[PDB]
Design a protein around this ligand. Structure first.
Ligand SMILES: *[C@@H]1O[C@H](CO)[C@@H](O)[C@H](O)[C@H]1NC(C)=O
Ligand SMILES: [Ca+2]
Ligand SMILES: [Ca+2]
Lengths: 83, 82, 196, 82
């Protein structure tokens, strides 16, 4: 909470969870990224920049690869087609 | 998309003399259109004009007109890919 | 070859560039028409966003954002806001007449808005099979207008519509049963004949 | 009274999983609620509701000392009564 309120005041503190030894709970595959982009990278998504530039929010997202697919990190190569 | 067939069925049932036959021929047209895309539909029931064809017959769904008649026996080498 | 106009007829109906009307009651923000289409360079990315209008009602807000040559304009509550300014301001001309706002966004691209719900983008033959979005590719052929973003033709307008959803985490519109009397005419035959 | 799917978008409220946390946004009304994995709540009221809100989070005035206004309109000092 001390992080989150301090983040809401306009000065987000970075990497406080490195040695806190406590981390927030998140679904398997994703790690608690301090100031993750609210703009995800789902496999079926149109690449529209400058229209998804909302404020950053703390939360947990997939690893560096592993684009989202219905709340389950999968490698960018295996994005399934939909019809 | 079954919208055109819906309009066709309403028109046929209201306008024609015998609404039973028109309804059971409009549903059949839609079913044939669907089965032209691979999707077979089982729409026939006692309240929906299940075919009562002669006594020595029986209704099927995926028939085999290769050997149904027996001129095919008279001409076996003749192709029957159907 | 004459010009061509999209049209957002009513609140959930669209009229593509090749004269195809369809029904798509969205809730999210969609790509009404864009030029960043395939291997083309592309210039503009007009977007339309629905708010509270899956069921056509008297709230039904709409907002269009035009991302043409850099800066982006947006139309909301009968007003035009130029959030970021176009780099060739010689082209921009927001002429207002009658009950409509007419935006002249260059040579071949223009937009007509009736301040409430009707939106119509007008193109000249410059584009001519270079666009896509909820308005088809504008190539004279009316059959292939439902090509979703996956470059495949969909037989159902709602699928082709959800394909153009800008944010891939908001709600897909449901496949509503097909009936003539949508919501309140459902069992009110009196009202049905009245509206007829 | 009926369980619904997710995401949900009716009546101007958008309910979706953002960054792994369930989120309920109502920007038309100027509010955004959120629930993380462990179960914490988080409400982001707007600024139009300045000095206007009245609830278990206290009125939204810059002062932090008069935030225990009960429903009767009288300030208390024991959090449980508030
Ligand atoms: C808020 O409203 C109260 C009650 O009318 C008034 O006493 C107070 O001065 C107001 N405070 C601010 C910050 O406007
Ligand atoms: Ca076309
Ligand atoms: Ca206070």
């Amino acid at each position: 909470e001390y992080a989150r309120t301090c983040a809401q005041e306009g000065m987000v503190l970075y990497g406080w969870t490195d040695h806190s030894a406590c981390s927030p709970v998140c679904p398997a595959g994703m790690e608690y990224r301090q100031c993750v982009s609210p703009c995800a990278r789902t496999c079926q998504s149109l690449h529209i920049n400058e229209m998804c530039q909302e404020r950053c929010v703390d939360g947990c997202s997939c690893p560096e690869g592993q684009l989202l697919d219905e709340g389950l990190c999968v490698e960018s190569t295996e994005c399934p087609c939909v019809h | 998309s079954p919208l055109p067939y819906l309009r066709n069925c309403r028109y046929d049932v209201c306008s024609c003399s015998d609404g039973r036959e028109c309804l059971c021929g409009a549903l059949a047209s839609y079913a044939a259109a669907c089965a032209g895309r691979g999707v077979r539909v089982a729409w026939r029931e006692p309240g929906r004009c299940e075919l009562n064809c002669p006594k020595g017959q029986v209704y099927l769904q995926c028939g085999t007109p290769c050997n149904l008649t027996c001129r095919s026996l008279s001409y076996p080498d003749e192709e029957c890919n159907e | 070859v004459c010009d061509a106009t999209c049209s957002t007829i009513g609140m959930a109906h669209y009229l593509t560039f090749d004269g195809l009307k369809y029904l798509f009651p969205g809730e999210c923000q969609y790509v009404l028409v864009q030029d960043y289409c395939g291997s083309n360079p592309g210039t503009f990315r007009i977007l339309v966003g629905n708010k509270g209008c899956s069921h056509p009602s008297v709230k039904c807000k709409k907002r269009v954002t035009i991302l043409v040559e850099g800066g982006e304009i947006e139309l909301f509550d009968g007003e035009v806001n130029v959030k970021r300014p176009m780099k060739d301001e010689t082209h921009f001309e927001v002429v207002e007449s009658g009950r409509y706002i007419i935006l002249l966004l260059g040579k071949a691209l223009s937009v007509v808005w009736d301040r409430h719900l009707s939106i119509s983008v007008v193109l000249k033959q410059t584009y001519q099979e270079k666009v896509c979005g909820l308005c088809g590719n504008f190539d004279g052929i009316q059959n292939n207008d439902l090509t979703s973003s996956n470059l495949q033709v969909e037989e159902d307008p709602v699928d082709f519509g959800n394909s153009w959803k800008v944010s891939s985490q908001c709600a897909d519109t449901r496949k509503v049963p097909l009936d003539s009397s949508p919501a309140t005419c459902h069992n009110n035959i009196m009202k049905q004949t009245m509206v007829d | 009274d009926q369980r619904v799917s997710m995401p949900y978008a009716s009546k101007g409220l958008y309910l979706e999983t953002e960054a792994g946390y369930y989120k309920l946004s109502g920007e038309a009304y100027g509010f955004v609620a959120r629930i993380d994995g462990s179960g914490n709540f988080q409400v982001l009221l707007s600024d139009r509701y300045f000095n206007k809100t009245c609830g278990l989070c206290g009125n939204f005035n810059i002062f932090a000392e008069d935030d225990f206004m009960t429903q009767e309109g009288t300030l208390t000092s024991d959090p449980y009564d508030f």
